[PDB]
Protein backbone atom coordinates (compact mmCIF):
# COMPACT_ATOMS: atom_id res chain seq x y z
CA UNK A 1 0.00 0.00 0.00
CA UNK A 2 1.25 3.48 -1.03
CA UNK A 3 -0.23 6.74 -2.38
CA UNK A 4 0.82 8.25 -5.75
CA UNK A 5 0.55 11.79 -7.11
CA UNK A 6 0.40 13.46 -10.54
CA UNK A 7 0.14 17.22 -10.29
CA UNK A 8 -2.35 18.17 -7.58
CA UNK A 9 -4.18 14.84 -7.73
CA UNK A 10 -3.31 12.14 -5.17
CA UNK A 11 -4.92 8.69 -4.97
CA UNK A 12 -4.24 6.03 -2.31
CA UNK A 13 -3.71 2.61 -3.87
CA UNK A 14 -2.05 -0.81 -3.35
CA UNK A 15 1.65 -1.22 -4.34
CA UNK A 16 0.96 -2.81 -7.75
CA UNK A 17 -1.50 -5.58 -8.68
CA UNK A 18 -1.20 -6.78 -12.27
CA UNK A 19 -1.78 -4.05 -14.82
CA UNK A 20 -3.10 -4.96 -18.24
CA UNK A 21 -1.55 -3.27 -21.24
CA UNK A 22 -4.17 -3.38 -23.96
CA UNK A 23 -2.77 -5.32 -26.92
CA UNK A 24 0.71 -5.26 -25.39
CA UNK A 25 1.18 -1.65 -26.44
CA UNK A 26 2.01 1.35 -24.35
CA UNK A 27 0.39 4.64 -25.26
CA UNK A 28 2.97 6.61 -27.25
CA UNK A 29 3.10 9.91 -29.13
CA UNK A 30 2.99 10.64 -32.90
CA UNK A 31 6.28 11.72 -34.57
CA UNK A 32 7.10 14.80 -36.75
CA UNK A 33 6.91 13.12 -40.16
CA UNK A 34 3.11 12.96 -39.96
CA UNK A 35 0.16 14.37 -41.91
CA UNK A 36 -0.01 17.56 -39.80
CA UNK A 37 3.62 18.62 -39.26
CA UNK A 38 2.80 22.23 -40.16
CA UNK A 39 0.37 22.64 -37.28
CA UNK A 40 2.60 21.22 -34.53
CA UNK A 41 0.30 19.19 -32.20
CA UNK A 42 0.83 20.47 -28.64
CA UNK A 43 1.26 17.61 -26.14
CA UNK A 44 -0.32 18.67 -22.79
CA UNK A 45 1.72 17.73 -19.72
CA UNK A 46 1.14 19.88 -16.62
CA UNK A 47 -2.44 19.49 -15.38
CA UNK A 48 -4.05 17.88 -18.42
CA UNK A 49 -2.34 14.51 -17.70
CA UNK A 50 -3.42 13.65 -14.11
CA UNK A 51 -5.87 11.68 -11.96
CA UNK A 52 -9.55 12.20 -12.70
CA UNK A 53 -11.77 10.33 -10.27
CA UNK A 54 -15.39 10.07 -11.48
CA UNK A 55 -18.63 9.80 -9.52
CA UNK A 56 -18.67 6.44 -7.83
CA UNK A 57 -21.31 3.95 -9.07
CA UNK A 58 -23.24 1.83 -6.60
CA UNK A 59 -23.20 -1.89 -7.27
CA UNK A 60 -26.45 -3.63 -6.33
CA UNK A 61 -27.79 -7.11 -6.44
CA UNK A 62 -29.97 -5.88 -9.34
CA UNK A 63 -27.22 -4.02 -11.23
CA UNK A 64 -26.88 -5.07 -14.86
CA UNK A 65 -23.66 -3.24 -15.64
CA UNK A 66 -22.19 0.10 -16.68
CA UNK A 67 -20.14 1.48 -19.57
CA UNK A 68 -18.37 4.74 -20.35
CA UNK A 69 -17.19 6.14 -23.64
CA UNK A 70 -13.74 7.60 -24.24
CA UNK A 71 -12.77 10.32 -24.76
CA UNK A 72 -16.36 11.42 -24.18
CA UNK A 73 -16.14 10.62 -20.43
CA UNK A 74 -13.76 13.55 -19.83
CA UNK A 75 -14.75 16.02 -22.56
CA UNK A 76 -16.93 17.70 -19.95
CA UNK A 77 -14.47 17.20 -17.13
CA UNK A 78 -12.06 19.98 -16.40
CA UNK A 79 -8.94 21.03 -18.22
CA UNK A 80 -8.86 17.90 -20.37
CA UNK A 81 -12.40 18.66 -21.57
CA UNK A 82 -11.08 22.14 -22.12
CA UNK A 83 -8.65 20.89 -24.80
CA UNK A 84 -11.04 18.20 -26.04
CA UNK A 85 -13.53 20.81 -27.22
CA UNK A 86 -11.54 23.78 -28.49
CA UNK A 87 -9.11 21.62 -30.48
CA UNK A 88 -9.79 20.29 -33.99
CA UNK A 89 -7.83 16.98 -33.68
CA UNK A 90 -7.03 14.60 -30.79
CA UNK A 91 -5.23 11.34 -29.97
CA UNK A 92 -4.48 9.88 -26.53
CA UNK A 93 -3.98 6.82 -24.36
CA UNK A 94 -5.39 6.08 -20.91
CA UNK A 95 -4.64 4.48 -17.58
CA UNK A 96 -7.95 3.15 -16.22
CA UNK A 97 -8.21 2.08 -12.62
CA UNK A 98 -11.49 0.54 -11.44
CA UNK A 99 -11.67 -0.01 -7.61
CA UNK A 100 -14.20 -1.53 -5.18
CA UNK A 101 -14.57 -1.23 -1.43
CA UNK A 102 -16.31 -4.17 0.15
CA UNK A 103 -16.02 -6.28 3.28
CA UNK A 104 -14.76 -9.83 3.45
CA UNK A 105 -18.44 -10.73 3.87
CA UNK A 106 -19.56 -9.33 0.55
CA UNK A 107 -19.20 -11.36 -2.62
CA UNK A 108 -19.33 -10.96 -6.34
CA UNK A 109 -17.25 -10.56 -9.47
CA UNK A 110 -17.06 -7.79 -12.06
CA UNK A 111 -15.58 -8.16 -15.56
CA UNK A 112 -13.76 -4.99 -16.60
CA UNK A 113 -12.98 -4.67 -20.29
CA UNK A 114 -12.11 -2.13 -22.98
CA UNK A 115 -13.85 -2.42 -26.34
CA UNK A 116 -12.71 -0.18 -29.18
CA UNK A 117 -15.54 1.18 -31.35
CA UNK A 118 -18.29 0.10 -28.93
CA UNK A 119 -21.23 0.86 -31.18
CA UNK A 120 -24.52 0.59 -29.26
CA UNK A 121 -27.63 -0.93 -30.78
CA UNK A 122 -31.32 -0.54 -29.99
CA UNK A 123 -33.99 -3.17 -29.32
CA UNK A 124 -35.48 -2.07 -32.65
CA UNK A 125 -39.03 -1.70 -31.31
CA UNK A 126 -39.07 -5.19 -29.78
CA UNK A 127 -40.33 -6.95 -32.91
CA UNK A 128 -37.15 -5.80 -34.64
CA UNK A 129 -39.06 -4.14 -37.45
CA UNK A 130 -38.29 -0.60 -36.22
CA UNK A 131 -34.96 0.82 -37.43
CA UNK A 132 -34.62 2.91 -34.23
CA UNK A 133 -31.26 4.44 -33.33
CA UNK A 134 -29.61 4.89 -29.91
CA UNK A 135 -30.04 8.38 -28.29
CA UNK A 136 -27.14 10.75 -27.72
CA UNK A 137 -27.58 10.12 -23.96
CA UNK A 138 -26.90 6.42 -24.61
CA UNK A 139 -24.22 6.83 -27.27
CA UNK A 140 -22.16 9.42 -25.36
CA UNK A 141 -23.28 9.27 -21.63
CA UNK A 142 -20.71 11.60 -20.11
CA UNK A 143 -18.90 11.01 -16.83
CA UNK A 144 -21.83 9.33 -15.22
CA UNK A 145 -21.55 6.52 -17.70
CA UNK A 146 -24.60 4.51 -18.71
CA UNK A 147 -26.32 1.31 -17.53
CA UNK A 148 -26.64 -1.70 -19.74
CA UNK A 149 -30.19 -2.82 -20.44
CA UNK A 150 -29.28 -6.20 -21.92
CA UNK A 151 -25.77 -7.22 -20.75
CA UNK A 152 -25.94 -10.70 -22.23
CA UNK A 153 -25.64 -9.13 -25.68
CA UNK A 154 -23.79 -6.00 -24.54
CA UNK A 155 -26.70 -3.91 -25.78
CA UNK A 156 -25.32 -4.66 -29.23
CA UNK A 157 -26.10 -8.22 -30.27
CA UNK A 158 -22.78 -9.69 -29.20
CA UNK A 159 -22.04 -12.31 -26.46
CA UNK A 160 -20.58 -10.85 -23.27
CA UNK A 161 -19.32 -14.40 -22.65
CA UNK A 162 -16.71 -13.55 -25.27
CA UNK A 163 -15.91 -10.05 -24.03
CA UNK A 164 -12.69 -11.48 -22.59
CA UNK A 165 -11.26 -11.39 -26.11
CA UNK A 166 -10.75 -7.66 -25.32
CA UNK A 167 -8.25 -6.09 -22.91
CA UNK A 168 -9.82 -6.99 -19.60
CA UNK A 169 -9.44 -7.82 -15.96
CA UNK A 170 -11.59 -9.45 -13.29
CA UNK A 171 -12.53 -7.96 -9.93
CA UNK A 172 -13.49 -10.90 -7.75
CA UNK A 173 -14.29 -9.50 -4.34
CA UNK A 174 -12.88 -12.50 -2.48
CA UNK A 175 -9.48 -11.97 -4.09
CA UNK A 176 -9.13 -8.39 -5.32
CA UNK A 177 -10.92 -5.08 -5.32
CA UNK A 178 -9.18 -3.28 -8.17
CA UNK A 179 -8.39 -3.70 -11.87
CA UNK A 180 -6.04 -1.60 -13.97
CA UNK A 181 -5.95 -1.30 -17.73
CA UNK A 182 -3.66 0.69 -20.04
CA UNK A 183 -5.20 1.58 -23.37
CA UNK A 184 -3.12 2.74 -26.33
CA UNK A 185 -4.65 5.06 -28.95
CA UNK A 186 -6.60 2.72 -31.24
CA UNK A 187 -8.03 4.04 -34.52
CA UNK A 188 -7.69 3.82 -38.36
CA UNK A 189 -6.29 7.36 -38.44
CA UNK A 190 -3.48 9.01 -36.43
CA UNK A 191 -5.76 11.86 -35.19
CA UNK A 192 -9.53 12.23 -34.99
CA UNK A 193 -12.42 14.33 -33.61
CA UNK A 194 -12.60 14.24 -29.80
CA UNK A 195 -16.32 15.09 -29.67
CA UNK A 196 -17.67 13.11 -32.60
CA UNK A 197 -15.79 9.82 -32.39
CA UNK A 198 -15.51 7.67 -29.23
CA UNK A 199 -12.47 5.48 -29.82
CA UNK A 200 -13.50 2.92 -27.21
CA UNK A 201 -15.79 1.90 -24.40
CA UNK A 202 -15.12 0.90 -20.82
CA UNK A 203 -17.36 -1.93 -19.73
CA UNK A 204 -17.71 -3.11 -16.12
CA UNK A 205 -20.32 -5.84 -15.68
CA UNK A 206 -21.21 -8.16 -12.80
CA UNK A 207 -20.88 -11.77 -13.95
CA UNK A 208 -21.21 -13.23 -10.44
CA UNK A 209 -23.87 -10.99 -8.83
CA UNK A 210 -23.34 -8.92 -5.73
CA UNK A 211 -24.36 -10.68 -2.57
CA UNK A 212 -24.12 -10.25 1.20
CA UNK A 213 -26.31 -11.03 4.21
CA UNK A 214 -28.97 -8.72 5.69
CA UNK A 215 -27.28 -5.97 7.63
CA UNK A 216 -24.18 -5.54 5.52
CA UNK A 217 -23.92 -2.35 3.47
CA UNK A 218 -26.25 -3.26 0.52
CA UNK A 219 -24.51 -1.18 -2.14
CA UNK A 220 -20.84 -1.56 -3.03
CA UNK A 221 -18.93 1.36 -4.54
CA UNK A 222 -17.23 1.00 -7.91
CA UNK A 223 -14.87 4.00 -8.27
CA UNK A 224 -13.34 4.79 -11.64
CA UNK A 225 -10.14 6.81 -11.61
CA UNK A 226 -8.49 7.49 -14.97
CA UNK A 227 -5.47 9.36 -16.29
CA UNK A 228 -4.65 10.37 -19.91
CA UNK A 229 -1.35 9.18 -21.30
CA UNK A 230 0.52 10.79 -24.18
CA UNK A 231 -2.40 12.98 -25.24
CA UNK A 232 -2.03 15.35 -28.20
CA UNK A 233 -4.28 18.12 -29.54
CA UNK A 234 -4.18 20.09 -32.82
CA UNK A 235 -5.88 23.14 -34.35
CA UNK A 236 -7.04 25.51 -31.56
CA UNK A 237 -10.48 27.25 -31.76
Amino acid sequence: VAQLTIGNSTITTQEAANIIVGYGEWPSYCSDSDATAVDKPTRPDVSVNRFYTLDTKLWEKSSKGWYWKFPDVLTETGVFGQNAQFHYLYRSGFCIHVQCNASKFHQGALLVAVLPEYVIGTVAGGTGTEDTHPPYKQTQPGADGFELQHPYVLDAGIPISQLTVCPHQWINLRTNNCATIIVPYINALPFDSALNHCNFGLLVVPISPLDYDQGATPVIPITITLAPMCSEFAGLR
Binding site: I11, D55, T217, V219
Partner: protein, 119 residues
Protein backbone atom coordinates in the same frame (compact mmCIF):
# COMPACT_ATOMS: atom_id res chain seq x y z
CA UNK B 1 -9.55 7.39 10.89
CA UNK B 2 -10.57 5.58 14.07
CA UNK B 3 -13.39 3.43 12.78
CA UNK B 4 -13.55 -0.34 12.87
CA UNK B 5 -10.88 -2.40 11.13
CA UNK B 6 -13.59 -4.03 9.11
CA UNK B 7 -14.81 -0.66 7.79
CA UNK B 8 -13.73 0.59 4.36
CA UNK B 9 -14.35 3.48 1.97
CA UNK B 10 -12.86 6.55 0.30
CA UNK B 11 -12.82 10.24 1.24
CA UNK B 12 -11.62 13.12 -0.94
CA UNK B 13 -9.67 15.72 1.04
CA UNK B 14 -9.17 18.95 -0.89
CA UNK B 15 -7.24 22.19 -0.54
CA UNK B 16 -8.54 25.28 -2.23
CA UNK B 17 -5.87 28.00 -2.25
CA UNK B 18 -6.65 31.52 -0.95
CA UNK B 19 -9.18 33.40 -3.06
CA UNK B 20 -10.61 30.17 -4.42
CA UNK B 21 -14.12 29.46 -3.01
CA UNK B 22 -15.39 26.26 -1.52
CA UNK B 23 -16.04 23.82 -4.38
CA UNK B 24 -19.68 23.44 -5.37
CA UNK B 25 -19.38 19.64 -5.35
CA UNK B 26 -17.00 16.70 -5.07
CA UNK B 27 -16.59 16.74 -8.81
CA UNK B 28 -15.11 20.22 -8.97
CA UNK B 29 -13.17 19.72 -5.77
CA UNK B 30 -11.50 16.82 -7.55
CA UNK B 31 -10.28 19.20 -10.25
CA UNK B 32 -8.14 20.96 -7.69
CA UNK B 33 -5.48 19.89 -5.24
CA UNK B 34 -6.74 16.81 -3.48
CA UNK B 35 -6.12 13.39 -2.01
CA UNK B 36 -8.31 10.35 -2.44
CA UNK B 37 -8.02 8.74 1.01
CA UNK B 38 -8.94 5.04 1.29
CA UNK B 39 -9.36 4.41 5.01
CA UNK B 40 -9.55 0.77 4.08
CA UNK B 41 -5.92 0.91 2.94
CA UNK B 42 -4.34 3.50 5.23
CA UNK B 43 -5.56 4.71 8.60
CA UNK B 44 -3.87 8.12 8.50
CA UNK B 45 -3.22 10.63 5.77
CA UNK B 46 -1.54 14.00 5.88
CA UNK B 47 -2.40 17.10 3.89
CA UNK B 48 0.00 19.92 3.45
CA UNK B 49 -1.12 23.49 3.43
CA UNK B 50 1.57 24.94 1.16
CA UNK B 51 1.39 28.46 2.47
CA UNK B 52 -0.39 30.79 4.81
CA UNK B 53 0.70 34.34 5.57
CA UNK B 54 -0.92 36.59 8.17
CA UNK B 55 0.69 39.84 7.01
CA UNK B 56 -1.88 42.05 5.32
CA UNK B 57 -2.67 44.94 7.72
CA UNK B 58 -6.26 46.03 8.43
CA UNK B 59 -7.84 49.04 10.13
CA UNK B 60 -11.55 48.17 10.50
CA UNK B 61 -13.63 49.52 13.42
CA UNK B 62 -10.95 51.68 15.09
CA UNK B 63 -8.81 48.75 16.21
CA UNK B 64 -5.98 47.97 13.77
CA UNK B 65 -5.42 44.19 13.35
CA UNK B 66 -2.92 42.28 11.15
CA UNK B 67 -5.24 39.68 9.52
CA UNK B 68 -4.87 36.85 6.97
CA UNK B 69 -6.97 36.88 3.78
CA UNK B 70 -4.73 33.88 2.97
CA UNK B 71 -7.49 31.58 4.12
CA UNK B 72 -6.94 28.52 2.01
CA UNK B 73 -9.73 25.98 2.57
CA UNK B 74 -9.68 22.34 3.40
CA UNK B 75 -12.87 20.50 2.38
CA UNK B 76 -13.53 16.82 3.07
CA UNK B 77 -15.94 14.89 0.89
CA UNK B 78 -17.33 11.37 0.84
CA UNK B 79 -15.90 9.85 -2.36
CA UNK B 80 -17.60 6.51 -1.68
CA UNK B 81 -20.18 5.66 0.95
CA UNK B 82 -19.07 4.21 4.29
CA UNK B 83 -18.87 0.45 3.82
CA UNK B 84 -19.16 -1.96 6.62
CA UNK B 85 -20.12 -5.63 7.18
CA UNK B 86 -22.64 -6.97 9.63
CA UNK B 87 -21.49 -6.26 13.19
CA UNK B 88 -19.42 -3.17 12.57
CA UNK B 89 -20.58 0.29 13.76
CA UNK B 90 -22.12 2.62 11.15
CA UNK B 91 -20.40 5.67 12.47
CA UNK B 92 -16.71 6.23 12.93
CA UNK B 93 -14.70 9.24 13.92
CA UNK B 94 -11.76 11.05 12.37
CA UNK B 95 -9.27 12.91 14.55
CA UNK B 96 -7.42 15.80 13.03
CA UNK B 97 -3.94 16.72 14.15
CA UNK B 98 -2.14 19.81 12.93
CA UNK B 99 1.10 21.66 13.19
CA UNK B 100 3.28 24.11 11.33
CA UNK B 101 6.05 22.94 9.03
CA UNK B 102 9.75 23.76 9.48
CA UNK B 103 9.56 26.82 7.24
CA UNK B 104 7.16 28.44 9.70
CA UNK B 105 7.98 31.70 11.55
CA UNK B 106 6.42 34.44 13.69
CA UNK B 107 7.15 38.19 14.21
CA UNK B 108 6.29 41.04 16.55
CA UNK B 109 5.68 39.82 20.08
CA UNK B 110 2.16 40.70 21.26
CA UNK B 111 1.07 39.67 24.76
CA UNK B 112 -2.69 39.15 24.69
CA UNK B 113 -5.02 36.88 26.59
CA UNK B 114 -8.40 36.71 28.29
CA UNK B 115 -6.95 34.35 30.82
CA UNK B 116 -5.03 36.57 33.23
CA UNK B 117 -3.90 36.17 36.83
CA UNK B 118 -6.81 36.92 39.23
CA UNK B 119 -7.09 39.53 41.98
Amino acid sequence: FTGSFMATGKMLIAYTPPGGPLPKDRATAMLGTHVIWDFGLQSSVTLVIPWISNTHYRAHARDGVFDYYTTGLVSIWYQTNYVVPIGAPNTAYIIALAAAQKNFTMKLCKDASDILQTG
